[PDB]
Ligand binder design. Structure first.
Ligand SMILES: Cc1cc2nc3c(=O)[nH]c(=O)nc-3n(C[C@H](O)[C@H](O)[C@H](O)COP(=O)(O)O)c2cc1C
Ligand SMILES: Cc1cc2nc3c(=O)[nH]c(=O)nc-3n(C[C@H](O)[C@H](O)[C@H](O)COP(=O)(O)O)c2cc1C
Lengths: 200, 200
């Protein structure tokens, strides 16, 4: 089995979601030591913003590409081939200003291509990234789970389902900003959630 | 009064949300010819991505800022002063991959600052951008309104409410990708909605 781990926090070593993702990788290596694990850090190695030039590479028209466009198409091809090559997809999704981090958003914007990761049919869209199992590790300062201020969870569920990844489990670490006690309990509960996932 | 218009599409003159925003401005200048109108195009003049460095300017620590951090702080202060200086806020919010555009998101990430545009109190968050009225002009390829795939609408309501802009009117232009007839009808209906808003 091959595991891809996507890190998207801007807080580096202090990141709650990067710490839980590392715990995830540690546990998986112990319990399934034959599996290869690939870790991509979307903050350390940023994906460019999808602008008018880059959208012209992914939704091309009848003209030669610019060198920048060609480079963005190569990066997009590389990210998609990596996504399709792996079985278990662990996505670190910190909440910043009620959304996912731009670092993760830029990744998703290069991964979503018609005829590559999805296509529209007469019955609606069909996802082309098939047979995957995803785990979202999502950290928040406050408590939002199951309430009107959590658009991150349904958004991730919607975008992932769109490209074909409909088996998604969520690990939450909420209330981090209430203090070190609340954060430690949040981390211990998340680690126990990760344990059940790794041991299944 | 003073109207601020924020454009966020990556499609330039072909933008459906930009065309509707221009129509809004035209109608506003006819019905309210004394009002000041400011247009900021977040794609033509892009805001930087909130990364580790920039978050250190917005959420500072006990050390001198870098040149780049000082520059980003000055840009954030400019965008916030501009937001607070206008009474009516028009936001063109095209949907890309079930989210807002990164061009718009980068704007929000620089505008959301503790003690400046919001603060946390014992009774929860309180917005500091007060007395405003907003109009969201949001274009989509498909039909999403009032269904589970529209996370853009509640996200904008939530984010705008958080900084204090609770009075928000949504204008939709959906179904653009079904073809020229459907797009024509979308524009026609959205312009009618804009006419009611402006003439009220
Ligand atoms: C730029 C910024 C924006 C944030 N916005 C929110 C917010 O919208 N809601 C929330 O509950 N916490 C918010 N937080 C708190 C983070 O969600 C919390 O620190 C979480 O652990 C971040 O995950 P990370 O440590 O892996 O980066 C924000 C933090 C930062 C850095
Ligand atoms: C990068 C890209 C992603 C898109 N993703 C979606 C999608 O998630 N759902 C949808 O209904 N339309 C999607 N569309 C269609 C646009 O929402 C539609 O073209 C809309 O008119 C864009 O607004 P604009 O013309 O002002 O840029 C997408 C278009 C592009 C360029």
């Amino acid at each position: 089995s091959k595991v891809l781990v996507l890190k998207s926090s801007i807080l580096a070593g202090y990141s709650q979601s990067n710490q839980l993702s590392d715990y995830f990788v540690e546990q998986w290596r112990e319990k399934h030591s034959a599996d290869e694990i690939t870790v991509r850090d979307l903050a350390a190695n940023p994906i460019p913003v999808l602008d008018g030039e880059l959208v012209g590479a992914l939704r091309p028209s009848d003209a030669p590409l610019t060198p920048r466009q060609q480079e963005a198409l190569a990066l997009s091809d590389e990210l998609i081939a990596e996504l399709k090559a792996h079985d278990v997809i662990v996505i670190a999704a910190p909440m910043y200003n009620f959304n996912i981090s731009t670092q993760l958003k830029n990744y998703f914007d290069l991964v979503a291509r018609a005829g590559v990761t999805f296509r529209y049919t007469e019955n609606g869209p069909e996802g082309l990234v098939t047979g995957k199992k995803a785990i979202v590790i999502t950290s928040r300062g406050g408590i939002h789970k199951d309430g009107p201020t959590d658009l991150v969870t349904p958004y991730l569920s919607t975008f992932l389902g769109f490209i074909g990844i409909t088996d998604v489990k969520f690990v939450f670490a909420e209330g981090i900003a209430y203090g070190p006690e609340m954060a430690a309990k949040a981390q211990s509960d998340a680690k126990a959630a990760i344990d059940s996932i790794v041991s299944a």
